[PDB]
């Protein structure tokens, strides 16, 4: 019953600044076979359908801007947004795909 | 161009049944998995389960939360995903997203616009 805790719950910030957010896992999400961390980050703008940002912990999906950087391995992961734009306002979920799938509670980003 | 279109949402009452549909296109349907993720209004996302692809045998998996009540099937020919729901409990209510899954990126790289389900007496 993998449990993904994201920190913080919410965080507001002014545009252009650098933010981080934590993803913490119950079990190690590391596969020793292909040596991949089975974790993905998902962006969801208000009232819109979620969007894959990153997979395998650090691999940025096609089209996603460079300012989105994912890191960490095992049980500890973080999502870093260097220079937050207005378009970034949205809830961010980390998800374990190590065994089936499980989403975290999400970290909501605000832009004031 | 990848397209995922869900449908079959609306008001229902608990214990009843509801059939959610999700049309696809712009990619080889049978090459990928297909998951169902839901999000209760004002809450987080929830993975209900997926249905594997051709190489795996189109077998299905479910989260403990919906295992037994819900059942997932696909129609390779028309490339349409389905979610057969049973006993629409009060906490079953939410927007239902079908997505494109697999063991390639091990993530849902394409999502639909979702279909809203509201349970009212
Ligand atoms: O359930 C699967 O068939 C699947 O292959 C999905 C993959 O994303 C991966 O999670 C895999 C497990 O890691 C076990 O190999 O299960």
Considering only CB atoms, which chain B residues are within 8 Å of A9? none
A4 contacts A96 by C-beta, under 8 angstroms: yes
Indicate the number of domains in chain B. Answer: 1
- Superfamily in which the A1-112 domain is placed by CATH: Immunoglobulins (2.60.40.10)
Domain span including residue B121: 1-121
Give me B21's structure tokens.
């549909």
Minimum Cα–Cα distance from A106: chain B residue: B44
Distance (Å, whole) CA A68 – CA A80 = 6
What b/e readout covers A19-55, taking b as 16+ CB neighbours within 10 angstroms? bebbbbbeeebbeeeeebbbbbbbbbeeeebbbbbbb
Ligand 1 touching residue B52 (CB < 6 A): yes
**Secondary structure letter of residue A61 according to DSSP:** P
Q: Which of A56, A91, A106 is the closest to B106 by Cβ?
A: A56
Cα–Cα distances in angstroms (integers) from residue A26 to residues A14, A76, B50, in the given order:
32, 10, 22
Ligand 1 touching residue B103 (CB < 6 A): yes
Distance (Å, whole) CA B33 – CA B56 = 9
What b/e readout covers B77-106, taking b as 16+ CB neighbours within 10 angstroms? eebbbbbebeebeeebbbbbbbbbbbeebb
A45 contacts B39 by C-beta, under 8 angstroms: no
CA torsion through residues B44, B45, B49, B55, sign:
negative
Contacts (Cβ under 8 Å, ≥6 apart) of B100: B2, B4, B24, B27, B32, B33, B34, B108, B109, B110, B111
**What's the gap in Å between A85 CA and the centre of ligand 1?**
35
Distance (Å, whole) CA A104 – CA A95 = 6
Identify the three-state secondary structure at position B62: strand
Task: Please provide residue B2's backbone torsions phi and psi, each rounded to the nearest 5 degrees.
Answer: -75, 135
B93 contacts B78 by C-beta, under 8 angstroms: no
Distance (Å, whole) CA B52 – CA A40 = 19
Q: How was this structure determined?
A: X-ray
CB contact under 8 A, A101 and B109: no
Q: Residue B103's domain is classified under what CATH number?
A: 2.60.40.10
B20 contacts B83 by C-beta, under 8 angstroms: yes
Contacts (Cβ under 8 Å, ≥6 apart) of B42: none
After which residue numbers is chain A interrupted with C–N beyond 2.5 angstroms?
none
B62 contacts B73 by C-beta, under 8 angstroms: no
Distance (Å, whole) CA A4 – CA A75 = 9
The number of beta carbons lying within 10 Å of the beta carbon of residue A61 is: 18
B66 contacts B43 by C-beta, under 8 angstroms: no
Q: How many residues does chain A have?
A: 112
Expressed in Å, this structure's resolution amounts to 2.0
All structural domains of chain A with their residue ranges: 1-112
Ligand 1 touching residue A97 (CB < 6 A): yes
Q: How many Å lie between the alpha carbon of B113 and the closest alpha carbon of chain A?
A: 6
Q: How far is CA B77 from the centre of its chain?
A: 18
Beta partners for residue B54, in sequence order? none
Using the structure block, give the residue that is written with the tokens 């207005």: A86
Query: Is beta strand A39-44 parallel, antiparallel or unpaired with respect to A36-37?
Result: unpaired
Cis status, amide bond into B18, omega within 30 of 0: no
């Amino acid at each position: 019953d993998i449990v993904l805790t994201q920190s913080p719950s919410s965080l507001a910030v002014s545009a252009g600044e650098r933010v981080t957010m934590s993803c913490k896992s119950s079990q190690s999400l590391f596969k020793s076979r292909n040596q991949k961390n089975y974790l993905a980050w998902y962006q969801q703008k208000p009232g819109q359908s979620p969007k894959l940002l990153i997979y395998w912990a650090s691999t940025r999906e096609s089209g996603v801007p460079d300012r989105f950087t994912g890191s960490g391995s095992g049980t500890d992961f973080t999502l870093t947004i260097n220079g937050v734009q207005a378009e970034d306002l949205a809830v961010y979920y980390c998800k374990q795909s190590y065994n089936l799938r499980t989403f975290g509670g999400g970290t909501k980003l605000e832009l004031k | 161009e990848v397209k995922l279109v869900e449908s079959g949402g609306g008001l229902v009452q608990p214990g009843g049944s509801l059939r959610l549909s999700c049309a696809t296109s712009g990619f080889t349907f049978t090459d990928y998995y297909m998951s169902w993720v839901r999000q209760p209004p004002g809450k987080a996302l929830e993975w209900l389960g997926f249905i594997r692809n051709k190489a795996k045998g189109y077998t299905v998996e479910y989260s403990a939360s919906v295992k037994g009540r819900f059942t997932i099937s696909r129609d390779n020919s028309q490339s349409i995903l389905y979610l057969q729901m049973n006993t629409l409990r009060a906490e079953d209510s939410a927007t239902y997203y079908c997505a494109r899954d697999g063991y390639y990126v091990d993530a849902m790289d394409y999502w639909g616009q979702g279909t809203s389900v509201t349970v009212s007496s």
